[PDB]
């Protein structure tokens, strides 16, 4: 169990290199530039390719084209940059091309406060593209998690064949300190690569799979020849406008993710043992919540709970429903104007309390103890 000294972006880059990423394309923008400055030195040493393109559209297009051919790749941006990749994110979702997109949040709407922290891309990344879409998004909450959540993001992108978002924050992104990370050899054991069909038996069927599992996309330039397009396609890849195929395609794109729900979403629950209040909150506000709950207990009463999702989308609707049916007082804390509160309220079928702040500053567990008085 090796332990190091770095910040969030160095850990994201180290995890990306160690899990096996060998390609990166991007366009510079703060605060998501440190990952590019790290990958540009880390990738040539291991034989990978780093390229800086002319905008964000090209940045995501070259990464999609490199991972189409069988190379593990990623990209990264922040806010106004992610707003420019949403036409290619749909191409990645429909053609089933694995890609990991790291988004480092800052204060929005358009440029706004380019040096401040926010949590405003939650409802945006719930459904960023036109048409229908099924998101997968992870939210690191410390320095140990900036590493393992990135390994998990790569594993999920290779297991589901879909674009996975990594919802980093400027706080964790720039926060510096001591970290503990797993064993390198133990990280290498747990790696999940995409599967390829060999046979003699040419592929004949990249997209002809069952209704609850992804497609098998063999690497390019190896004898297995197929078509890759962004339209409603058939078994080998040629477009169609049939109703049966066009409906079953989207049903499978949804069911291959909503059937792995027990492996996909984790979540952290603490002190839910006879508590009176629950303080559902995600992201880096978890850092303030875990200290408010550490101070408030030593002068006061009425034990307070905490339920933190580790995978935002798809949401743990059943566990939220159970917690809401069990306990009488809930409190949602966020750094926006009520974005993830709507999901917590459509689950639980009930109105709850809210404590939001969208002025570019953090919550400061003084305020949290002051709000638990109500």
């Amino acid at each position: 169990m090796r332990e190091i000294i770095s910040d969030g972006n160095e850990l994201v880059a180290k995890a990306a290199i160690e899990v096996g990423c060998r390609f990166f394309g991007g366009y510079p923008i703060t605060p998501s530039s440190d990952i590019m400055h790290a990958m540009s030195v880390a990738l040539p040493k291991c034989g990978g390719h780093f390229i800086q393109m002319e905008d964000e559209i090209s940045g995501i297009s070259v990464s999609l084209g490199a991972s189409m051919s069988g190379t593990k790749s990623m990209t990264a941006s922040s806010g106004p940059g992610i707003s420019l990749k949403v036409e290619q994110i749909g191409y990645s979702f429909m053609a089933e091309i694995p890609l990991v997109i790291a988004d480092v949040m800052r204060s929005g709407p358009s440029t706004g406060m380019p040096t401040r922290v926010a949590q405003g891309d939650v409802n945006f990344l719930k459904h960023p593209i036109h048409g229908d879409f099924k998101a997968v998004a992870l939210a690191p909450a410390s320095l140990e998690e900036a590493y393992t959540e990135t390994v998990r993001a790569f594993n999920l992108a290779e297991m589901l064949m879909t674009p996975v978002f990594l919802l980093m924050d400027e706080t964790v992104g720039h926060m510096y300190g001591k970290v503990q990370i797993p064993d390198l050899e133990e990280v290498q054991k747990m790696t999940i690569n995409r599967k390829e069909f060999v046979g003699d038996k040419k592929d004949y069927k990249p997209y002809g799979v069952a209704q609850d599992e992804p497609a098998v996309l063999n690497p390019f330039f190896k004898g297995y020849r197929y078509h890759v397009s962004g339209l409603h396609h058939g078994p080998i890849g040629f477009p169609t406008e049939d109703a049966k195929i066009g409906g079953d395609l989207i049903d499978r794109l949804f069911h291959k993710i909503e059937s792995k729900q027990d492996i996909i979403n984790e979540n952290e629950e603490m002190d839910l043992e006879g508590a009176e209040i629950v303080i559902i909150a995600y992201g880096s506000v978890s850092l303030a919540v875990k200290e408010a709950l550490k101070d408030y207990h030593k002068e006061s009463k009425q034990k307070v709970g905490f339920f933190r999702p580790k995978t935002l989308w798809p949401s743990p609707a059943k566990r939220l429903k159970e917690i809401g049916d069990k306990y009488e007082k809930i409190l949602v804390i966020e750094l926006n104007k009520g974005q993830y509160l709507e999901e917590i309220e459509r689950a639980m079928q009930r109105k709850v309390h809210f404590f939001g702040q969208a002025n570019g500053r953090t919550i400061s567990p003084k305020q949290i103890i002051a709000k638990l008085k109500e």
Binding site: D55, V62, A66, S69, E87, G230
Partner: protein, 273 residues
């Protein structure tokens, strides 16, 4: 390559779908012929093409083919070629693709000199979406969105790509396929960014309202507009109004490919740092 075109084709797809006389099957024939003439193996060739009516070309060939979004063929192709820097990648797009919505990507691909084989299918309008105006439509012509006469000006793709920094520039048309294949075979063997401007004919959507509704009237007009390179190089500026020189227009031989230099950065990256 010859009366046997079916080795390189997804024969179950043909007959094609274009109209009846589009100058698009001629370019496909020429591409297949020049691929065979060079001794290339279709297990090494990839063909990525944008969306439009030249985007159907990536459906009929029997290789690893890709069909991308509008204006992004060159970026996907850059990625594919960079991840496999020993195989042969060919890009096919129209004039409303990489010169209208994707002119930025084309200019930067010319600039950084990636070993691609861009091939522009130039028919002077947007054909798929029923005759809108292109950046290459001549002035005074009836288009669906300029119904009194087009007043926007024109691009010269060859001059623009030359100014950006391409290493091999060439122009030809579907009015002489042998010269088209000679140009293609000389440009495929080049080891930088090769740009081919190919004048095609759209008689159904362009010439139909400009009284070139037959294929042969459009073909004679296109022939009248095209002169050789030395013909053009000798005429006076009095005389070069709407004339286009054909042939190889630039073959820089003292240049450096992109991946050939990133390999040097790779070797001194951890060749003991």
């Amino acid at each position: 390559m010859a009366f046997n075109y079916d080795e390189y084709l997804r024969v179950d797809k043909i007959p094609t779908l274009w109209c009846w006389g589009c100058g698009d099957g001629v370019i496909l024939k020429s591409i297949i012929r020049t691929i065979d003439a060079l001794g290339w193996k279709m297990d090494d060739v990839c063909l990525v093409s944008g969306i439009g009516c030249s985007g159907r070309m990536s459906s009929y060939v029997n290789c690893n083919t890709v069909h991308t979004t509008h204006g992004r063929a060159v970026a996907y192709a850059t990625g594919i070629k960079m991840a496999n820097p020993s195989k042969h990648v060919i890009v096919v797009s129209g004039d409303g693709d990489g010169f209208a919505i994707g002119g930025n990507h084309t200019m930067h691909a010319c600039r950084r000199n990636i070993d691609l084989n861009f091939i522009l299918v130039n028919n002077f309008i947007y054909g798929l979406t029923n005759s809108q105006t292109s950046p290459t439509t001549p002035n005074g012509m009836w288009t669906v969105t300029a119904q009194w006469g087009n007043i926007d000006n024109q691009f010269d793709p060859c001059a623009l790509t030359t100014a950006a920094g391409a290493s091999f520039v060439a122009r030809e048309s579907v009015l002489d396929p042998q010269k088209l294949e000679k140009v293609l075979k000389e440009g495929f063997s080049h080891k930088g960014f090769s740009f081919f401007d190919v004048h095609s004919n759209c008689h159904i959507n362009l010439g139909r309202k400009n009284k070139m509704g037959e294929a042969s009237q459009m073909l004679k007009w296109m022939e009248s507009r095209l002169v050789s390179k030395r013909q053009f190089e000798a005429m006076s500026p009095e005389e070069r109004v709407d004339k286009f020189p054909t042939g190889v227009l630039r073959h820089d031989t003292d240049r450096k490919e992109y991946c050939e230099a990133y390999q040097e950065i790779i070797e001194k990256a951890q060749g003991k740092q």
